Symmetry: C6
Subunit: 215 residues, 6 copies
């Protein structure tokens, strides 16, 4: 990473990433952990992290297709200019330079370090996180429409399932807000559903959980 | 975190937090450990810590509702002023800027680092700890009124149960002082209760435990 | 801690403390380990360490009663003066300021860092260690008067038991010196007791253990 | 390594390398991990890493034959000049000097540190990674022509196998692009093969996996 | 420790020491490990290390008796002078000041740090290592006179036993040299004894082990 | 070690060394690991590492005999000069000063640090590695003349055995080159032996292993 001078990615950081992928597969929390293990990383470092994954190769191919798309959008949105690079400047970074394919570690340290800086590590990380989100959507087992409280399921476990499935869903904040605003009370079991309908449309989750607590 | 320059949150700190949540669920000691693992953290770091939790999603939703309330109270209590930000200054932080939603890492490092500083990491941490306290109250099994010494329970185990349940209770220092002042002696078993009533209302816990030791 | 600038307490230091309390309960060695894990700590750090303990709540209540007593003795022994604090100075620390209750981390770093310094971390640590000693006395199973060598117990195991129980006892160096000077030889089994009585009152433990070695 | 001054390779880095070779044998991910554990390494450090491997001696001999070839190509491509080395300069590095055989640690730190620098650590690492790639090709069990989807195999597992075997293959990006462009759809089972043939030759892997998802 | 400014002893160093005592008891290698974990330590640090030992209290009492003797020899050999300590100087350290009993951490950092320095940490460590050697002698099971090669024992195992027991013995280099010079060949089994007697009195251990290898 | 100022050897480095000796006994890879854990070490550090080994005492005695020989060769090759050491200089190091016997840590830091420097740590390490090589030769079970491919042994396992045994052999690069040049093809089983004899005397190990792959 870069912290300002450049460090190598640590054996502990990399190892941590590997163990995360092995254990948690592609659960949502994988992405923050990644974003934490990859904080201040260069495209070489990120490439190292993705490469360290054995197995899960289908997902990885999806991810590099996403990276390809974002790199091409970068290229069309940033047309390269022809001409000799001045002494005090650096060349213009292509989409492949953001993904670490056609760029050296010194060039990455250059763009991140030299002034008027381009944060290629954070741009590449953004693309990677896009692909990862698409993957978590891909491998999510459930859909929020199918989370229904059981007749003998305590309210709390039903809310755990509900907001896990909701974390996994592909929707804007307004659509998720609508799903909370509608399905949670709608798809509780008859008893808790009557209690919550008696609370009103403006009660907080704390009040709803305390209300259906003994139930 | 920030220690003055900015570090990334370490794989060991994050991993420690994750293991704490897995093992201890939402016991009181979770909150100090958090406050220790999150010492000097940015809202991005705190967001990373909360995001790293798989499962327990109901509690997390409660927590972000708490964060929403505290952010809105901040917003009404700090009305934003319209006008162009001067060169030597920074913009005014909204409630969403405290929670890391609408603010960049460089803006957080700005408010914490630049002089006349606003400790947004400690404010956000305060809100988070508020929500966590509400959660520990939520998931506490017992109430202090129900801790009664058993006929064959040694005094020490009864005091362990009593002050654990008392740690979990939602009450001011004066109400807790009253609970110690009344229920502990009141709800001991008849033998120890007679001994402690013989000691008087001004004896220390050391003297009470030494008195009912052989009992 | 503070090492001069202020660090946060590490996940490894805290975790180590927690494991010590879990495994060794309240054995004497707990207190040095504490004093080692808490070296150069602030009252916030010490509070974090005590708070990280789940269970053992009776002992913790005893400990905060001890802290209360030492804080009140500090308060009566250091009467606060009324008047406006000058620019180049800091306020006077109360007993509650030593225990981290009514003081900020910056105020603690102030008293420890600013010149004419008050080591509030070492004072608070002294109070805590007082309470811990009282606890180790509380939970010690044995009394030094009851350590008697068995008929078939090797001398070395008897000395191990003897000086463990002696480590746990509440007595000045002169009283412990008397206990060594009397009970160790007095309460050995008849054979070793006759050997040691034949050595004389001025022989060292090395000579006593070598004498009763084959026995 | 060198980070600018020279460090020793850490017990944790070396140990990590050893464990990687023990567990993962010669899977592709071994090479990135190596390239990560060996970041900024000297030829002495790399030699230490290769030497720390017990067993797998056939592969190691293959690797030092590769290193020999690359060193001889370096030697013929860089003919050494006869004459006394000036005070302000260093000698010219042979192929054996790149591999750490005939060069001291101070000479390596010289070439990497002194200006007009020669990155002998990265050149040697390049040769080593060449040999490692040849080894991974050697020990790969399968060939991409033999990955055929089973009648009851979900599409995702078939893509995992396919792009693992494809990661192990020895082919340029254009040949791999052709293999993706042809065999993946060609060698799916009849059902998924008909679905994918119905999608068209321009569909992305995400669309193909979503299409054959329920299948 | 002190490395120049003062560090606290690390949780890892202390924990390592504890585990060493638990596992290896009082084997010779305990003393180097100690001397390595205690490198550059203050008497407070060393006291922490000895205090962290639970159990083995007989040995510890022997050790503090040794420390007492060495402190008294220091006191008689360094008579304290009466008079007011000058501003630019420090007081004279007693034997109890070397053992950390009657001296503050700042006074130890003073003697070790301030010029014309007294290395009280290395003196105290010397005394401690004296006591530890006396303990290893105490708990050694065997005597070098009793190591005799078995009729079917390979020569190498007999030499392992011999030089382990010889490591544990209390003797000068000349007495140990005599023991090697005599007993090793003398107390081998008849076959190897005849071979070694045929080699001569000037053969090295390598030659002796190669000679009795097949035997 | 020394990295320029002097560090203590770490608990992790030492512990790593101990575990290496426990697990791998005296396999070849022990020596690089040593040379890596001992990088930049002082004779005190190296002495600590050798001392930390429990058991294996025969080998250790062989090693200190080797160290004695190399020290005596140093002494005869470096005759000490009589006369008072000038202020700006240091004394001349004996062979015993290289091995840490008759020299202080400050004298070692002097020779390594002060200019016109003598690297006594690397000289002592050279002697130690000499003894270690002699030991690995001592405890090697096999001889390269006895590695013969089995009738049903795959070629790769036979090459693993062959170059392991070859790593353990005591021979110059030319003798090892002859052993590769002759015995490997000579001592394969009849089938692979005929294939390899058909390849020719100039084929690489890669080609030989690919040739006898299916066999
Ligand atoms: C962790 C989680 N669960 C969800 C369910 C549905 C939709 C999204 C999610 C998420 C990700 C998620 O929302 N993570 C939160 C951090 C967080 C985690 C846990 C509790 C409180 C705050 C986050 O990244 N931000 C910016 C945020 C912070 C405060 C309030 C609102 C949002
Ligand atoms: C740990 C604990 N147990 C309780 C029972 C009832 C109510 C609250 C609690 C707590 C939290 C709790 O009170 N923690 C203590 C620290 C502490 C922990 C353990 C022993 C002594 C001091 C704390 O945060 N402060 C500021 C404090 C310090 C000294 C005296 C009084 C309070
Ligand atoms: C560890 C221990 N065992 C005891 C038995 C009875 C009374 C007290 C104790 C103690 C605590 C104990 O005495 N610890 C010792 C350190 C120590 C530990 C072990 C061996 C030698 C020195 C200590 O803190 N100091 C200041 C000390 C140092 C040297 C001599 C005498 C005292
Ligand atoms: C990891 C992997 N799987 C393959 C299958 C066939 C051929 C090669 C490979 C590889 C190595 C592989 O291609 N690793 C990638 C990094 C990577 C890994 C995983 C997902 C996305 C990006 C890499 O090194 N670079 C330079 C790269 C980066 C972005 C897009 C394309 C290439
Ligand atoms: C480890 C050991 N085994 C013994 C048997 C009998 C008497 C003493 C011992 C020792 C302690 C022992 O002798 N340790 C050695 C270090 C050492 C350890 C192992 C092999 C070579 C060198 C030591 O401290 N010094 C100063 C030393 C160094 C080189 C040659 C001779 C002595
Ligand atoms: C590891 C090993 N196996 C052997 C078999 C027979 C004789 C010696 C050995 C060795 C030690 C061995 O040769 N280690 C190699 C490093 C190495 C290890 C593994 C693969 C490639 C390079 C080494 O130290 N040097 C200086 C070296 C480097 C490149 C080419 C040739 C030699
Ligand atoms: Cl690391
Ligand atoms: Cl690691
Ligand atoms: Cl998944
Ligand atoms: Cl790769
Ligand atoms: Cl940009
Ligand atoms: Cl951008
Ligand atoms: Cl679910
Ligand atoms: Cl949407
Ligand atoms: Cl509920
Ligand atoms: Cl880390
Ligand atoms: Cl970790
Ligand atoms: Cl809980
Ligand atoms: Cl998230
Ligand atoms: Cl503020
Ligand atoms: Cl505020
Ligand atoms: Cl309870
Ligand atoms: Cl209240
Ligand atoms: Cl009790
Ligand atoms: Cl840490
Ligand atoms: Cl940890
Ligand atoms: Cl206890
Ligand atoms: Cl608390
Ligand atoms: Cl004071
Ligand atoms: Cl004071
Ligand atoms: Cl006992
Ligand atoms: Cl007393
Ligand atoms: Cl005994
Ligand atoms: Cl390390
Ligand atoms: Cl390690
Ligand atoms: Cl393999
Ligand atoms: Cl080697
Ligand atoms: Cl070059
Ligand atoms: Cl080059
Ligand atoms: Cl496969
Ligand atoms: Cl090709
Ligand atoms: Cl699928
Ligand atoms: Cl640590
Ligand atoms: Cl630890
Ligand atoms: Cl022992
Ligand atoms: Cl103590
Ligand atoms: Cl001195
Ligand atoms: Cl001295
Ligand atoms: Cl024995
Ligand atoms: Cl002697
Ligand atoms: Cl033998
Ligand atoms: Cl360490
Ligand atoms: Cl360790
Ligand atoms: Cl061996
Ligand atoms: Cl020793
Ligand atoms: Cl030299
Ligand atoms: Cl030399
Ligand atoms: Cl073999
Ligand atoms: Cl030879
Ligand atoms: Cl083969």
């Amino acid at each position: 990473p870069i912290v300002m001078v450049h460090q190598a990615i640590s054996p502990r950081t990399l190892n941590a990433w590997v163990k995360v992928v092995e254990e948690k597969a592609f659960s949502p929390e994988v992405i923050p952990m990644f974003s934490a293990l990859s904080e201040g990383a260069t495209p070489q470092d990120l490439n190292t992290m993705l490469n360290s994954v054995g197995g899960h190769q289908a997902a990885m191919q999806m991810l590099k297709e996403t990276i390809n798309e974002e790199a091409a959008e970068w290229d069309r949105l940033h047309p390269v200019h022809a001409g000799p690079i001045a002494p005090g400047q650096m060349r213009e970074p292509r989409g492949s330079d953001i993904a670490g394919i056609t760029s050296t570690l010194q060039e990455q340290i250059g763009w991140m370090t030299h002034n008027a800086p381009i944060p290629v590590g954070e741009i590449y990380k953004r693309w990677i996180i896009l692909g990862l989100n698409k993957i978590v959507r891909m491998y999510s087992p459930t859909s929020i429409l199918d989370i229904r409280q059981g007749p003998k399921e305590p309210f709390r476990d039903y809310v755990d399932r509900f907001y896990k499935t909701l974390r996994a869903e592909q929707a804007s904040q307004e659509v998720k807000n609508w799903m909370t605003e509608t399905l949670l009370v709608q798809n509780a079991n008859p008893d808790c559903k009557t209690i919550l309908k008696a609370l009103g449309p403006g009660a907080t989750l704390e009040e709803m959980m305390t209300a259906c607590q003994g139930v």
